[PDB]
Amino acid sequence: RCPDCGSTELVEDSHYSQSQLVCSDCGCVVTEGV
């Protein structure tokens, strides 16, 4: 779940070679870096 909005729309979307699991609703970066 997202720590800010509590949503479950956590998508793994890499932004320019940066692995990043981020919430799809508010854009809160859950996890980043591999």
Binding site: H15, C26, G27
Partner: protein, 99 residues
């Protein structure tokens, strides 16, 4: 490739690019031309103050797609970064606190 020579005296850094060069005499000697593609990736952290507030507001409103703009916002109170590609950028611009 040891620690002293490869990791202490000389080490790799981020926020840098490498590109082939081409001549351009229409620019001053103290100026250098940067491609739009590299400029959108290499970012500079500007602190929100009383002077550049209205400029950073427009930069956030433009977003990470238009060239004049930003990519991330770090709040003063909490250090949780916010990506500008998601969420309402206008609300974030209207809530730009000093610092």
């Amino acid at each position: 490739q040891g620690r002293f020579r490869g990791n202490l005296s000389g080490k790799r850094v981020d926020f840098s690019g490498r590109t082939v060069i081409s001549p351009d005499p229409n620019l001053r000697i103290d100026e250098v031309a940067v491609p739009v593609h590299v400029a959108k990736i290499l970012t500079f952290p500007e602190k929100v103050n009383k002077a550049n507030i209205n400029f950073l507001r427009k930069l956030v409103q433009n977003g990470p797609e238009v060239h004049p703009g930003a990519n991330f916002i770090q709040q003063r109170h909490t250090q949780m970064k916010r990506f500008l590609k998601y969420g309402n950028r206008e609300k974030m611009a209207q809530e730009l606190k000093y610092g």
